[PDB]
Design a protein around this ligand. Structure first.
Ligand code: MBD
Ligand code: MBD
Ligand code: MBD
Ligand code: MBD
Ligand code: MBD
Ligand code: MBD
Ligand code: FE2
Ligand code: FE2
Ligand code: FE2
Ligand code: FE2
Ligand code: FE2
Ligand code: FE2
Ligand code: FE2
Ligand code: FE2
Ligand code: FE2
Ligand code: FE2
Ligand code: FE2
Ligand code: FE2
Lengths: 288, 288, 288, 288, 288, 288
């Protein structure tokens, strides 16, 4: 069973811009360059984000973490039973990712996905942020979340819930103009309100944004000013209606957006599915 | 599985009297008028109580909340297997209620019931009470409770426990005169001591009272004076023997009573069924 | 310096009525009869209330406690310097009161007052209430409080503040009819909001009421029913505006009233004098 | 000794605009109109802000609170010894302000000031905000603070510290252009970081802004959107360097600004005076 | 000003019996033998109890601790002003005691007393008890207490309070037969209820007993059995009325008794002097 | 009155070695270079340590912080009354130090000392350590401490206690060989066990070491390895007997040592002077 989103990889046209953006604006730690690409850390794990040179300027792959080898076997089995083409990653790929075992496949719309177990910890190389950030929230909640843009939400929903096992948290009916309302589905696989959201938005990218969660309000406020100085803010500070995250959005060098937030609420056993008509309680004024 | 009582609707002869009673006396928030009727809020949900014009001057319907679409399916199945006529609410009714999906049916004695999932939240329109009330207790405990008057308690008990899944908390042997003792059964579907109580009382209404729980003793004390000013108190302040709620009772414009309380105890896994011979430890002097 | 109100004595016409009232209705502990009269306890002290046969049917004397012999000396000196006639209680009186040393005198309007130190504790005879009461709040706050009725508030105020050292907490302008508004002054000598209140009320007694504070809301609720059964309630449950005490008032066999409350707020160093136009936030409906 | 800022009065050209601004945008409670003007509440006190019709469109007077009559006497004495013309407010003014006693005078630059004791509490009329606000922080910290604009900071400083007794918290060197740096002095009279700030800013008003502190971040976020809707924001959300308050600034109908914040730090006994070169850690982008 | 009882020395006829008693029965740590005698520890201090060979079989001297050299000077001055013969301990005595400075003198009835400052700590030699004891309570409360038997309580009281500065906690009227009642005075110099008690008991020793306080009830229970095995118990387990200590008493090899207790209450600023007629709430049955 | 040690300045022969040592080994933040020298931060203050090129390779000056201008005046007065030559720092020096006001003078043995008030805070430039360090403990405890080597301890003691106002915490008799025992005196001016220690050690430097305190054990462990890699450790990890600090010592490029520790205990009002015969409970093995 998938426990969390463990890592993500981006294929970008300007690797240098990304390196500077992630470290100096967002405060991630530069962890070196390997055949896996430029590596960035936010906690004890050897890397959480990989940046590789590429033409797409988008998310290249995402890795979901299981607890152990048995969990990996279960997922591989579940995918095969669903008719999905799964490939047991070879030692070379496993070594490149720094994991113990992994399987590779793609979602219904071509996003390369990986499920793995036994990632590398580097407690001996204590995390030191590239900018003043008190800390990132990961742990059992994993890396954070991202919104997957799809041409067909129902097909995407079936794959992610029925095959991958994500559970629905809530739905937000996004009013995009008078004759257009698009439902965005928020899914969880652990306590984090959502690790994945699905929506049929008309965008040139695989994802609308990815999100990183920090430990204090000041982390967000300081990062906002750093990003604003270069005119990269896309949405002002605000708080979401569903996860209650206080955040701002900014544009990465690839056009893909990043959400930087704090204080999200978690999902518990007493959770019930609900619907909303607005994605924000306050703030989040679009300055795009 | 039913998680809680989510909403209630009243069909009354004097809608204006009700509007003034709920907002000015009890402190509910007016949430507008729709084809669902005059809507009132007590928390983040779009509405909890609906008031419609009608001749019965009584509870018109009650909606029980399940966690998701699977839960709705389970309940529909359970009802069908019991031989109950269930109707899958159409999009029009679902839209009118502001829910994602729902099924409709009636209890053995004609009370229209609805089981739904995916109600609407309105965090962007922060709750502001119509009178000075610090807050209402809902959350996982739902709306509150009501006492269903029935001609046959055993038939009602079987339906609510065996078909709807409520569990018995305790029983109170109500001494109504020398030759009459009527057992009142208190049932729960979550932590709240009881979400439903059943008793064969000789009343012209479907329910004896509905109850709303507030956050502080002062909320109760202030509301008591507001209600008393118009001579609407039916029972003085007292504390119940079973749920330990400190409350007073008052008459609504429909004759149906409302209980306004604070500090009830909850039911846990170690709970055991017991019986009582009195419904109150102290207070609750009838001034009817 | 006066630390608290330590004990009170009543001279009543019906000693038996008082004994039954204090133990069975209020829950005090009967502590035996001596030359000091029928003694009642509420904590570890040998006695807090003494009931003696007498014609006045009123408060006969009150004893204020100092910390030690030096404190007694200070107060005696302060009184003498003010021209008050003070009498050093003799060993016989000290033994009768169960104290180590004491001085006697009277307030400007004839109420016998005593200031003493070294009262008797009886931890070896654990307190057992005469009725179901979880506990009384005394400790550093002392016995409770009483309202002294006087013909001239200014003269009384000067004596109690300038000579006895009480400090003003707040004032309540009591509206007693269209052409009459009487200010009631509330004074403290420790954390308890007020140990003494002064008002020019037209009453045949030295005090309007004395107050005892209990540990839980249920103590108050149960006592209310016990007292109400005999038709002795004078004011329904309510909460005061100044000390925030939740209480009810009842008539004692002498006509003097008793206030039985819970949850009063205390006075701290940041306290500032304020004024109120009402003595109650809610409740306290006079049923006299 | 001055314990806090207790109330403020504004003389404005558009009373209706102010009424709507304070209740609907900021969430204050309308408390009626008297010869003291339109009254607004934020807590248990009968009024904290008074709005009167007037030509200045500015702060008309401010009242500082002492603990009691002795404190009032001390301050009156201190002012007289300093050669300040003090007037003992007459019963008519005291009644108009709803206080027990007060003295009136002016600061060195003509701002009418009042020092009083024994203000009116109205616990019987529970605070109900005009907009969704969880609460305002007052208590021992008083009303909030305001920045007094003066032509000569040193003269103002001497009066406020040496005569009124305020203590310096810190100084911020405000860089207003290449050839201009103006020191702003922040003073406290209790735990609140500053109740008064003094700066020689070139403004047509007596004060730059007044500040109200709320209980949660959401109170600030929601109010920001309410104010922004009418285009009244003057500074975006940010956090100050000295008091660590998270706030935004907005324009009132008089041009005078209001700061609405949350989470300020307090001053303790271990506090030491420091200096800063910036008034904000992050945010507070001027949108004037 | 005396801060606490720091150490005690005994002059006994059977040093070996004492060594075995203190370590094996009470659990003290043997700290070696010096010209100061056999040393025993109960905490970080180099020694708290010294046992020397001697004929008296009693307390030979007690040392009271001041905070520093200034405190020592104050006490020396206070004693001289009282006409007491004080001797500044020489370097040889100071070195023998392991202190920085000390003065010697005697109480009115010949008990050698010492007031010192700058005792030796031995954190590098961690405390290891001679028997299973979780810990001893010392710290700011010092060593414990002892009861000084005197022929004249009033003379002793004057010396200890007026000259040494101890403060009275309470008094217990000890009923020793029909025609004899002896008051025992309990004095404190810090939070410990009493560091010294004075009573005119007819005993051949300078003290009735000394007391050591342990950290848990089991420490007391286990020690009781160890002592009882040798038939040395003098009083069964019980709890005192004044300090609320749960303890038992036992005979030392010198006839002098030792009290071993747990859970005593402390004295605070709100403390007031009281009197008791019994020294125990329960237990403490004399088995002498 | 001196509140704490605020800053220190070093005059060294190899500024580059120091820059690398402080940032890379100890984790301080580089704060730029000014006419005050290379500046390093450990908290919100603009700088705490200044490194200037110089021949002495030692501590050049230390600055003690007072709360305000009045405190500065008091100290200046105290020094003058003692016959010490004090110089009111001019605006140029004040600006160079980034303080509001300061006075300069020297200790009896030539160490330049400064007492100042109103240092600069830079909350807008959040602290970011040069190495992985969770945080430094400063606040009311100030910078840390240093041991001043002197030829005459008694003369130094008189100056620091009688003139500067430091209070003695404790003394450690340092056994330096058979015929040599040197007392080291530890003094405090706030909660930190000692801000200054004085000892007549035969060293070529003004100070034996300065100490910086970090927030966690791992901060110390990681720094130890960083320093050990270059063979700079002088004492292994250990814990002191007096302040209970867990620390290691290392050599700076000037030969002067630095102590890096965690978990020291503080001094409270109940503190009493004591003596020790060892400076360490465990560890601190000299590897010099
Ligand atoms: C668009 C959107 C809506 C709700 C929560 C989110 O985190 C989000 O990005
Ligand atoms: C009648 C009754 C009895 C017990 C608990 C209740 O809430 C109630 O209404
Ligand atoms: C009359 C009255 C008013 C305020 C507080 C009280 O306790 C009281 O008795
Ligand atoms: C201008 C300014 C600077 C610091 C704190 C404040 O509250 C403020 O208004
Ligand atoms: C005799 C006696 C009485 C009260 C407390 C004690 O500790 C004691 O020893
Ligand atoms: C030498 C020494 C002794 C005790 C505590 C210390 O911090 C220290 O440096
Ligand atoms: Fe789930
Ligand atoms: Fe998001
Ligand atoms: Fe159950
Ligand atoms: Fe009920
Ligand atoms: Fe007071
Ligand atoms: Fe009262
Ligand atoms: Fe201050
Ligand atoms: Fe401000
Ligand atoms: Fe005392
Ligand atoms: Fe004892
Ligand atoms: Fe000290
Ligand atoms: Fe050190």
């Amino acid at each position: 069973s998938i426990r969390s989103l463990g890592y993500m990889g981006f294929a970008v046209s300007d690797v240098a811009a990304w390196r500077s953006f992630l470290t100096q604006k967002l405060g991630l730690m530069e962890a070196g360059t390997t055949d896996n690409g430029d590596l960035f850390r936010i906690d004890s794990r050897a890397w959480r984000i990989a940046v590789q040179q590429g033409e797409v300027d988008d998310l290249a792959f995402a890795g979901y973490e299981v607890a152990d080898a048995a969990g990996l076997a279960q997922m591989a089995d579940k995918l095969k039973q669903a008719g999905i083409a799964v490939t047991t990653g070879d030692a070379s790929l496993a070594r490149r990712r720094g994991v113990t075992g992994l399987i590779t496949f793609a979602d219904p719309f071509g996003l390369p996905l990986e499920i793995y177990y036994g990632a590398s910890e580097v407690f001996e190389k204590p995390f030191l942020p590239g900018a003043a950030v008190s800390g990132f929230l990961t742990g059992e909640q994993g890396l954070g979340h991202f919104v997957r843009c799809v041409p067909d939400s129902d097909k995407a929903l079936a794959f992610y819930t029925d095959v991958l096992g994500f559970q629905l948290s809530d739905v937000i009916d996004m009013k995009m103009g008078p004759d257009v309302t698009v439902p965005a589905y928020f899914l969880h696989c652990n306590e984090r309100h959502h690790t994945l959201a699905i929506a049929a938005f008309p965008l040139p990218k695989r994802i609308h944004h990815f999100m990183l969660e920090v430990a204090s309000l000041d982390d967000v406020g300081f990062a906002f000013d750093r990003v604003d100085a270069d005119g990269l803010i896309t949405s002002t500070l605000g708080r979401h209606t569903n996860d209650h995250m206080v955040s701002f959005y900014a544009s990465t060098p690839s056009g893909v957006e990043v959400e930087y937030g704090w204080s999200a609420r978690t999902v518990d056993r007493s959770w019930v599915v609900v619907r909303h008509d607005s994605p924000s309680m306050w703030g989040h004024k679009s300055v795009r």
